[PDB]
C-alpha cells in the first residue's frame with residue numbers, strides 16, 4: 001500500500017516532528033527532500049520543503065507535484081506498461097503548516113494554498129498549537145476558516161456521504177485546520193512536550209487536535225485521498241498535457 | 247526623565263504584549279512605525295516614556311525591511327541635532343525622542359538566526375543599543391532553549407555584531423548586570439491576563455496543561471529584562487545613546503553640512 005505525504009511550511013515550523021509523531025518513528029533524509037520508508041504493509045514516502053518562505057516560493061512545490069504526475073502519465077502512455085509494478089509517487093495529501101501568530105492568514109499562505117488546491121489534497125494545520133491558549137485558538141481558527149472560504153480555496157474535506165464513516169469524518173472536518181502538537185519525548189505511555197509549568201499531551205484531544213489528524217491514516221481515508229488524487233488532481237494535469245501533446 | 251524604547255519584530259511576535267507586561271500598562275497608539283508617549287510615575291519619580299513598534303516588519307527584500315527603522319532612528323537624531331545647532335536654543339524645553347534601546351524580537355524557531363535578523367542587527371549596532379530577545383519563549387522547552395541561545399550567541403559573535411552589554415564597572419551593582427549579560431538573549435514571555443496570588447497581581451498565560459508565570463525566573467527571563475528599568479541601567483542606556491550613537495550620526499552630518 002503506497003501513500004505519499006507532503007509537508008509545506010517555513011523553517012523550524014515542526015514538519016519533521018509532526019511526521020515522526022504521526023507514524024511513531026524517526027525519518028532520516030535543494031528545495032525539497034523526499035525519503036521512502038517501508039512500515040510494518042505500507043510503503044510511505046514523506047516529502048518536506050527546504051527553506052520555504054526564504055511569489056515564487058511555491059514554485060518548487062508545484063514543480064515537484066507536476067513531475068510526479070508526469071512520471072505517472074509517461075508510464076500510462078507506454079507500449080509495454082506494467083502499472084501494478086510501477087511505483088506511484090504522486091502526492092496524496094499536503095499538510096500546509098500555518099504559523100501560530102494568533103493574527104490572520106498571511107498573503108503568502110493564501111496565494112500558495114490557492115495554487116495548490118487543484119494540484120493536491122490540501123489540509124491546513126496550525127503548527128505548534130501549544131503556542132496559543134484555548135480561547136484565542138478558536139478565534140484564530142475561525143479567522144483562518146473565514147479567509148479560506150471567502151477566497152474560495154478548495155481545501156480537502158473528508159467524505160461524509162457514507163454513513164459508515166460519516167460520524168468520524170464530519171468531526172474531522174469540523175476541526176480543520178487541525179491544531180497540531182508534535183513531540184519526540186515519551187513519559188508514563190504517551191508523547192509529551194514537557195515544560196516546567198506543565199506537559200502538553202499530544203494524544204489528548206483536550207490539548208490539541210492530533211488525534212483527529214491521525215484518523216487520516218484510517219484505510220478508508222487514505223484510499224479516499226488516493227482516489228481523489230488519481231481521479232481529480234491527476235486528471236486535471238493529464239487533460240492539460242494531452243492538449244499540449246495532441 | 248525621558249526614556250525611548252523601540253520594538254522590532256515580525257507581525258504578531260508579541261511586541262505590544264511585552265511592553266504592557268514590562269510597564270504594567272496598556273499602550274494605545276494613534277505606516278511603517280507607530281509611537282506613543284505616556285507619563286509614568288514610581289512614588290514621586292516621573293518618567294516620560296515613549297514606546298515605538300514596527301509595523302509589517304518582514305513583509306517587504308532585506309534592505310526595504312530595516313530601512314524604515316533606520317530612518318526613524320536617524321530622524322530622532324536629526325531633530326536633536328537641529329535643536330542643538332539652533333541660535334535661540336532651549337535644550338530643556340525640548341523633548342528628546344532619540345531611541346535609547348532596541349528590543350530585537352527573535353522568532354522561537356529553535357534553530358538558527360534568520361538571515362534577515364543578522365543583517366538587521368548589523369545595521370542597527372552603531373545606531374542604537376540593541377538587545378536581542380527570544381519572543382514567546384514559553385513555546386520552547388528548557389533543553390531546546392539552552393541550545394537555541396547558544397547558537398544565537400555564536401552567530402552574533404562570528405558576525406561581529408555589537409549588541410548592547412550592561413555595565414559591570416560600578417561595584418554596585420555589577421553583580422546584577424553581570425547576570426543580566428549572561429541571560430542575553432532574554433527568553434521573554436508576555437501576557438495581558440493577570441490573576442491574584444497571595445494578595446499580589448501576577449501576569450500569566452493559562453493553558454489546559456498549566457500556567458506560565460511571567461515573574462517566575464524558572465519559567466522565563468522576564469525578571470532579568472525588567473532590571474533594565476533600574477535607574478542606573480536606564481541612565482547608562484541614555485548616556486551611550488547620547489555620547490556614542492548620536493555622536494556617530496553627528497560627525498557624518500557635520501561633514502555633509504560643510
Ligand SMILES: Nc1nc2c(ncn2[C@@H]2O[C@H](COP(=O)(O)OP(=O)(O)OP(=O)(O)O)[C@@H](O)[C@H]2O)c(=O)[nH]1
Pocket residue numbers: 009010011012013014015016017018048049050051127128129130131180181182183193355356357385386390
Ligand atoms: N512549541 C512547539 N514546538 C515544537 C513542536 N513541534 C516541534 N517543535 C520544536 O520546534 C523545532 C522545529 O522542529 P522540526 O520538526 O525539525 O521543524 P521543521 O519544520 O522540520 O524545520 P526544518 O525541516 O529544519 O526546516 C524543534 O526543535 C522542535 O523541538 C510543537 O508542536 N510545539
Ligand SMILES: Nc1nc2c(ncn2[C@@H]2O[C@H](COP(=O)(O)OP(=O)(O)OP(=O)(O)O)[C@@H](O)[C@H]2O)c(=O)[nH]1
Pocket residue numbers: 101102103130131132136255256257258259260261262263264299300301302381382383384385434435436437451
Ligand atoms: N505563546 C505566547 N503568546 C504570546 C506571548 N505574548 C503575546 N502572545 C500572543 O501573541 C499574539 C500577538 O500579540 P501582540 O503583542 O499584539 O503581537 P505584536 O508583536 O504586537 O503584533 P503586531 O500586530 O504586528 O503589533 C497575541 O494574541 C498574544 O496573545 C507570549 O509570550 N507567548
Ligand SMILES: [Mg+2]
Pocket residue numbers: 015016017048
Ligand atoms: Mg525538518
Ligand SMILES: [Mg+2]
Pocket residue numbers: 261262263299
Ligand atoms: Mg503590536
